[PDB]
Amino acid sequence: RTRLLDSEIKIMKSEVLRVTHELQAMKDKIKENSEKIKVNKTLPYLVSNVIELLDVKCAVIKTSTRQTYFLPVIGLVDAEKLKPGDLVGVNKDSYLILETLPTEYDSRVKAMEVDERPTEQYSDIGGLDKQIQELVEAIVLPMNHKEKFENLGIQPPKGVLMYGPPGTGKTLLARACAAQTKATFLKLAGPQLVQMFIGDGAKLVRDAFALAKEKAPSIIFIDELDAIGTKRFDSEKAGDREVQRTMLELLNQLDGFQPNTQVKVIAATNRVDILDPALLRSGRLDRKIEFPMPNEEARARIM
């Protein structure tokens, strides 16, 4: 035993350096956290929109004070999780971005979402069991047996429409299935996509279908589609257009470029001849079912 005292003396010197090492970084946290809570106590965050992310690394944003800003240094958020078109919470004076704010959802879109579960059951609906059956299997089974449609292998049906006399029960099935399935039910009014300013109803379409894109179990309802679904017409000197704008993004945003099978559409009208046949094609609205008048027995059943 000769060198164990020298190497043990060196190891004891290394632990004696470890004491001032843990004390060194443990002293190093205070002065950096003191300015970290200084830039975090600036909690009023002037949010912006990420215009562009440079490569000569840098970025340009625009605050919602309509003010553009170049910056050389990004900040606490790195460049990799960012992209042009985002929206972040930014320091006021430095104009230095700090956080990542998630979404851009309108309050009217938040009003569209139910949280009530209006309880209805199918034996409260007598004498419509064919339309009830083909309605339920067209929506519920692409939400519970997906490998059954993939077993044979087909794209599942997409878009159902109900039409008929306005007293035959059309809201009733929607509130029924809204009580049945435990998904993100989302309802719409007819002239709800009608705005004074231009483009607001169209952005209201893409925001709602962005939210229904987000909730992957989700189905969308439309009541009284003919308020917006008026057939177009060629007219000089006059004629509305703005409703047909939102109708056209309802067409394209519904079906066409970049489709998906995540939402199912339930549309309710009473009159058909007003409607533009562009939504009546085959695939935008697949299953067009009418609700006739009760024969005798369903009249006994309702009362």
Ligand X SMILES: Nc1ncnc2c1ncn2[C@@H]1O[C@H](COP(=O)(O)OP(=O)(O)OP(=O)(O)O)[C@@H](O)[C@H]1O
Ligand Y SMILES: Nc1ncnc2c1ncn2[C@@H]1O[C@H](COP(=O)(O)OP(=O)(O)O)[C@@H](O)[C@H]1O
Beta bridge partners of 162: 268, 289
Smallest separation, CB 161 to ligand Y (Å)? 13
Cα distance between residue 269 and residue 170, in whole Å: 8
80 near other proteins, rule: CB under 8 A: no
126 near ligand Y, rule: CB under 6 A: yes
Contacts to ligand Y from residues 260-289, by CB under 6 A: 270
CB nearer to other proteins: give 127 or 142.
Answer: 142
251 near ligand X, rule: CB under 6 A: yes
Cα distance between residue 267 and residue 286, in whole Å: 11
270 near Mg ion, rule: CB under 5 A: no
110 near other proteins, rule: CB under 8 A: yes
CB nearer to other proteins: give 13 or 299.
Answer: 13
Question: Comparing C-alpha atoms, which of 185, 179, 182 is closest to residue 211?
Answer: 185
Please identify the residue of the shown chain whose CB is closest to the bound Mg ion.
Answer: 171
In the list Mg ion, ligand X, other proteins, none, the entry touching 44 (Cβ below 5 to 8 angstroms by class) is: other proteins
The encoded tokens of residue 14 equal 């290394």
**From the list 121, 123, 144, 282, which residue makes contact with other proteins (rule: CB under 8 A)?**
282
In the list other proteins, ligand X, ligand Y, none, the entry touching 81 (Cβ below 5 to 8 angstroms by class) is: none
43 near other proteins, rule: CB under 8 A: yes
Cα distance between residue 32 and residue 60, in whole Å: 27
Cα distance between residue 102 and residue 288, in whole Å: 38
Cα distance between residue 207 and residue 289, in whole Å: 28
Contacts to other proteins from residues 10-29, by CB under 8 A: 10-12, 14-15, 17-18, 21-22, 24-26, 28-29
Q: Which amino acid is at 211?
A: L
CB nearer to ligand Y: give 26 or 300.
Answer: 300
List of residues 6+ apart from 139 with CB closer than 8 A = 160, 177, 181, 219, 264, 266
DSSP states along 254-288: HSSSS--SS--EEEE-S--TTB-TTSSSSSSS-EE
CB nearer to ligand X: give 239 or 259.
Answer: 259
In the list ligand Y, ligand X, Mg ion, none, the entry touching 68 (Cβ below 5 to 8 angstroms by class) is: none
Q: Which helix (H) or strand (E) holds 220?
A: strand 218-223
Segment contacting ligand Y by CB under 6 A, of 44-52, 169-177, 207-215, 225-233: 169-177
Cα distance between residue 287 and residue 291, in whole Å: 13
Q: Can you say whether the dihedral through the CA atoms of 169, 170, 172, 176 is positive or negative?
A: positive
Contacts to ligand X from residues 45-64, by CB under 6 A: none
213 near other proteins, rule: CB under 8 A: no
Segment contacting ligand Y by CB under 6 A, of 94-102, 147-155, 163-171, 205-213: 163-171
